[PDB]
């Protein structure tokens, strides 16, 4: 909330899906054309925004943890999730999504399913 970050300003403004990858202690947007591709050595934050009938926005925040992501990436994905929820006035529901155990809800956001990729950005440690 006293948080000033360009992606926080873009977060959950219009209905849709937004995805960011944790890259060395920062929250970096994933190009829209690559939504669905997930590096197994990385951690990501997914925000699904839905327009409610009364005009309010309902949020579901999913932090996806790759099987080989480092502690700084999973730790930051979790913290970024709490921060975004706080920034969006706490209107979101937080979901922890572990590679191999993703919820049906999360998977449903990807019509063509998920594309796991070995590797990822190096730890920020």
């Amino acid at each position: 909330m006293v948080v000033e970050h360009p992606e926080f300003l873009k977060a959950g403004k219009e209905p849709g899906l937004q995805i960011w990858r944790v890259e060395k202690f920062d929250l970096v947007p994933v190009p829209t054309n690559l939504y669905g591709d997930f590096f197994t050595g990385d951690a990501y934050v997914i925000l699904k925004t839905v327009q409610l009938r009364n005009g309010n926005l309902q949020y579901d925040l999913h932090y996806w943890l790759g099987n080989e992501c480092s502690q700084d990436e999973s730790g930051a994905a979790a913290i970024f999730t709490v921060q975004l929820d706080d920034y969006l006035n706490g209107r979101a529901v937080q979901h922890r999504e572990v590679q191999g155990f993703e919820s049906a809800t999360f998977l449903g956001y990807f019509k063509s399913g998920l594309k796991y990729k070995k590797g990822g950005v190096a730890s920020g440690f």
Partner: protein, 372 residues
Amino acid sequence: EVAALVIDNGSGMCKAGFAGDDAPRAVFPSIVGRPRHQGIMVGMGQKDSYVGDEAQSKRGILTLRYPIEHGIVTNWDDMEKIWHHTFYNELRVAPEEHPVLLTEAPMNPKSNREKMTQIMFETFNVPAFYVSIQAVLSLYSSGRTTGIVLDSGDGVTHVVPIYAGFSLPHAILRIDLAGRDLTDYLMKILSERGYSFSTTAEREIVRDIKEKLCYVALDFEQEMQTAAQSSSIEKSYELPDGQVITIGNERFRAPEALFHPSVLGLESAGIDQTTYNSIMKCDVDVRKELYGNIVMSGGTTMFPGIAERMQKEITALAPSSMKVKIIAPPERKYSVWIGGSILASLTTFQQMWISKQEYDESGPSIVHHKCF
């Protein structure tokens, strides 16, 4: 830029380092030593105070003190000496040049939090400051925003339920039994086997036996007699004096006090029951997630077999349909510190620090809401 400094002030061990590092650069005893009779020469006790390893090694001529009891600072003069030492001698940097993140115990009094804030800004002149609850940093370290953390250290054992990033204070429970008590207890039962440990070096031996040979039995009763009919559980311990000894069932008897504090004349529920009790003080919608995310942190949770024993005990107290899961990170002795290192390195955390300017205009009482 300038790295923030991260310090986790344990009752027993201080963990200090730089944000962004994967582990604390300095881990040393939280002790301040002072000469009983100071000297004027090398090796005679010429310095007015010693901290950490040095104070420990110069035991013969100093009077040691522990300013932190059960995670709460109880001697501020001594705490400032430890902090001064930490910055200048351990981290080797001037504090006025770096944002500083300190940790605190769950349910730390408000007066203590303000005094700590006042010292950091007025005495060390820090440019930015933040204080975090230890258990929450450990939860973040494990890559979660929801869970119930069992933090058993040297001085205190706390159970802290956290939902969506926020601890639930009404459900926090404390068990006044920790590592220090376990070492003392192993010292007593080892003593009754016919051996002698009463001095600090001897006590340090027992602490070593505790951290290396002890374990939590899955089923105490059945484990006991399995040492009765066999020598399958006995390990030998080579003393510093060359003499070798054999530790048997004391291996599992000592940590058992965690599950039954009654063995220390202590009337408190054990760690399994207390975890259930805490979860039960939480809202139903939250309990399922807590049962599925019981996170262990602290040196005293390092006992082999503890997770397997907690899984069994909690499963027995929880509804049959409940998925119970125990998470015991191998790095849990530093989970709190690591959580702080990650937090203070986030690009998004740079606006979260209490500034010098802010302190100057509103004072120390702003720490509570600023670090909520």
